[PDB]
């Protein structure tokens, strides 16, 4: 579970027996053409994929580029985490246990778990920052119809890196019933492993899709990046492919500000919920609080896999601010008729970063910004507008 | 054409009839030109999403000894069927000429699809919507705001979608020279009838298609939910005379005799609502009456006139459920399966209750998801006293 000098499992002793039971029942259903069959249908009816590559023809004409847009806003619960919370809530159940917990900020994860675990017939409880369930509400009312248990978190930051404390928390707790489903690549190995190999399916697809419409590979794939999981599903397949792959990190107020979740821009190595990777610290090694006008980006670490294509070159990356991120979640809107996510629109921001005239230009739309609207709508900044 | 038996027709103010001549032959123009089809199917299928899955619900095949299977029209862009209908007539706009768009909608879902699609083309959009659905359905005036469009609440009448219609009919004979006006259902005036349910018949010729690979058969019965018609319409016109069971359902509020419902097929009159002869819940004096639901899409005192002559000639059954019935598969199948659908689909999937299906095959139109629904359905007593 190494990606160069990041990763392993940095745990509590308490969690090795569960984490190598784990590792055993994933190489099980590595092999498992049941498995595989049920996930697979699971993912074409009732996801709904494969997603389509949707050329945005409004976008592409002010850019002077040929946009693509990744449509994981299209999936079942709006977003690109139901990909991973499917196959995971399966293993789960397959490996009889009975009960789910995560953690969740823009409450997408939370969704995605509670609806598996509704699906699937389990027990679900979802820990979520407090002020995540007052920017987020909308995924907290679809939480508690799906019959999942939501706890607000109220100590820390009241947001991502609390929630997923508390969730690991319980789930040390309930050891024998209760399987942990985080929502991105974070983690001890081998979840940050098995969170990527469900979200490869998008690169793959994309990988298809892109020769049927230009006749080659992209110039550009462009993801925004938090925890990770959305932009390792599309970049994996495409490492040392020549294309320019660009993760886009939340620079919230501004990079020099102090005021962002910019990890690997700006954090330092060190260890957080089970990772080795870019943290942002002070300089005694404490984890700092991340800001983000995003819950989803509002994350202080990074994936283990992003620390490694960072340093070996595979993968580049930068970062947007809040108001970037906010002017293009009104352009997407208003141009193509597609309310991204919050999250996603730092990705859609990154067009104006980069030389893209005449280039193809694959966007990953991780998922749909109705959870965002009210807070959107209330920001100063687009009350300034 | 025009007419479906004796329902249909174009009864609408003088000053209309020149539109709809132009309309008439401008959709006779694109319904054979290959340039059409090739950019409005292209947009159906990356832009919207099409073909949408069709669903086996084990958990809920389980609990009815059936097999049920969902059509999944909540996976589209917008989360309902109406972004079918909404691009290609503001595709058919745009080759018109039009340069504003124009619609009243009662959910929202066809407000956000006609919104979603002006945006998509650069038209100037302005949405009218009833002040008590701006309210039961708040998420989607928020969404039609980003989307660039306006959105006027209206005030009158009963505030709800009978309303929001009269208001957008009166925009459009205002703005005839620039606007399209956009139903969302199969009520109106001819051409708008044929024109809706051509773009919606796609659900029901890929369900078609669908289901051989499930069953190796045809399914013994599908079942819609009906105010106007447009998602039940799409789902059963390439079935009709097939010898499937087709079963509408409208919306039976408070009771069939309460009086409070919006159950045209069963319990209105012969009459003429926005350019239709069709069923309208009336008076005994020819005056139009408000209709109830707890569902904001199937509040509707009307019903299309193709569907006045399906129950006419047989084709097509129909009945209705409650609000509780609604209600209570509202929040099944977000229970049973983790699909949270709209409160207008729940009335046909509230209908699995109400036939015998052991043993059978069983296809319900999903027409939308339900996110716009949560605030109203946890604040409703009903459900507060579950
Ligand atoms: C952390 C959460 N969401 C993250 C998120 C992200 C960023 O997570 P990854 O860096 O793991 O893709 C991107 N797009 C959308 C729509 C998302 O919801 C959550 O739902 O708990
Ligand atoms: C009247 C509206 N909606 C109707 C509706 C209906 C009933 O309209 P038709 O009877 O035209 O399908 C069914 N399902 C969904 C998701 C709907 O939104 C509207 O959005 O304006
Ligand atoms: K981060
Ligand atoms: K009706």
């Not at 040929?66 to 293993?91: M, P, S």
């Not at 230009?214 to 599309?234: F, H, K, M, T």
Request: aromatic share 8%; glycine share 12%.
């Amino acid at each position: 579970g190494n990606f160069g000098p990041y990763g392993g499992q940095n745990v509590p002793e308490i969690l090795m027996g569960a984490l190598e039971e784990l590792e055993a029942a994933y190489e099980g259903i590595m092999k498992d053409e049941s498995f595989w069959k049920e996930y697979n249908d699971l993912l074409r009816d009732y996801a709904g994929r494969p997603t389509p590559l949707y050329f945005a023809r409004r976008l592409s004409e002010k850019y002077g580029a040929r946009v693509y847009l990744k449509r994981e806003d299209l999936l079942h619960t709006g977003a690109h985490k139901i990909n991973n919370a499917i196959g995971q809530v399966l293993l789960a159940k397959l490996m009889g246990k009975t009960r789910i917990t995560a953690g969740t900020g823009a409450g997408q994860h939370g969704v995605a778990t509670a609806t598996a675990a509704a699906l699937f017939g389990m027990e679900c409880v979802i820990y979520m920052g407090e002020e995540d369930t007052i920017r987020q509400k909308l995924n907290v009312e679809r939480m508690k119809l799906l019959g999942a248990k939501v706890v607000p978190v109220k100590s820390g930051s009241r947001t991502l890196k609390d929630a997923i404390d508390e969730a690991l928390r319980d789930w040390i707790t309930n050891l024998q019933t209760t399987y942990y489903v985080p929502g991105s690549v974070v983690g001890p190995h081998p979840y940050p492993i098995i969170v990527r190999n469900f979200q490869k399916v998008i690169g793959e697809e994309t990988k298809k899709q892109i020769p049927e419409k230009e006749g080659r590979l992209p110039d550009y794939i462009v993801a925004c990046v938090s925890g990770g999981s959305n932009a390792a599903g599309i970049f994996y397949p495409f490492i040392d492919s020549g294309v320019k792959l660009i993760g886009v990190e939340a620079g919230g107020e501004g990079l020099e500000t102090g005021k962002h979740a910019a990890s690997l821009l700006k954090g330092k190595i060190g260890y957080l919920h089970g990772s080795k990777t870019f943290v942002l610290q002070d300089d005694w090694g404490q984890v700092q609080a991340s800001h983000s006008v995003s819950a989803g980006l509002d994350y202080p670490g990074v994936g283990p896999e992003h620390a490694y294509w960072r340093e070996t070159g595979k993968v580049l990356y930068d970062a947007v601010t809040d108001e970037e991120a906010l002017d293009a979640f009104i352009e997407l809107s208003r141009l193509e008729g597609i309310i991204p996510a919050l999250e996603s629109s730092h990705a859609l921001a990154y067009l104006k970063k980069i030389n893209i005239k005449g280039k193809v230009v694959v966007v990953n739309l991780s998922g749909r910004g109705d959870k965002d609207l009210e807070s959107v709508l209330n920001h100063p900044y687009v009350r300034e507008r």
